[PDB]
Amino acid sequence: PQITLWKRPLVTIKIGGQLKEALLDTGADDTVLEEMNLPGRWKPKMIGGIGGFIKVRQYDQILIEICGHKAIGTVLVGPTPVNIIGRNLLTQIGCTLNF
Amino acid sequence: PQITLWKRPLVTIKIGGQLKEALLDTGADDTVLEEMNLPGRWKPKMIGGIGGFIKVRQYDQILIEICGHKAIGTVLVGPTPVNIIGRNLLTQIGCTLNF
Numbered sequence A, B: 001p002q003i004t005l006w007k008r009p010l011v012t013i014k015i016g017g018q019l020k021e022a023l024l025d026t027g028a029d030d031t032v033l034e035e036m037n038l039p040g041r042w043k044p045k046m047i048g049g050i051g052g053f054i055k056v057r058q059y060d061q062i063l064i065e066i067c068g069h070k071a072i073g074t075v076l077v078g079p080t081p082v083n084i085i086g087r088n089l090l091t092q093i094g095c096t097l098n099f
């Protein structure tokens, strides 16, 4: 589909057997999701934006479904105010900017 | 143009007569640029990111050219980690997400 940007580009995603709302964010290299208790091993990481840094947990090879498009990649879990779908997964679903 | 997301969507912008590089950021409501000198008056404003809130200078009705497309809107100036073009201007240049 085509998503205009009058409002936030929020879409439903499926991760860890759960449905969630997340931004399609071309400004994020990686995917950052709100706190959730995923199984498996992880690595600590700190990520910075406006206001400073937050501590997150890096999970690798996580399966996410975005608007029925399947993708698998790194997911960072931490106290983010919004679920953020970054470029590492946007490319996998064939997402582009156009103007 | 059509922009793939295997690299950061960085573009050249023209603001206040000066060229700069900025990131097309669909996850940003607003446009925020690093500290710079801009003509005209401004108002103190607050904006929040992934790591908290910062103080910015709000310039309204500013001429800004993005990858050859002209826009006139609000530009926030403050300690953002990188220059970001937000939806308030992406809409003006007719930018959409497509997959």
Ligand SMILES: CCC(CC)CN(C[C@@H](O)[C@H](Cc1ccccc1)NC(=O)O[C@H]1CO[C@H]2OCC[C@H]21)S(=O)(=O)c1ccc([C@H](O)CO)cc1
Residues within 6 Å of the ligand: A025, A026, A027, A028, A029, A030, A031, A032, A047, A048, A049, A050, A076, A081, A082, A084, A086, B023, B025, B026, B027, B028, B029, B030, B031, B032, B047, B048, B049, B050, B051, B080, B081, B082, B084, B086
């Ligand atoms: C300048 C920050 C960007 C460029 C460095 C990167 N950011 C993504 C932007 O899209 C954020 C997304 C966001 C939306 C709402 C609340 C919190 C975050 N938008 C945003 O700050 O917009 C400003 C302005 O407009 C206003 O509307 C929204 C809030 C206000 S990030 O989240 O901080 C992030 C950092 C590092 C990674 C690495 O890849 C991981 O390793 C991945 C993501």
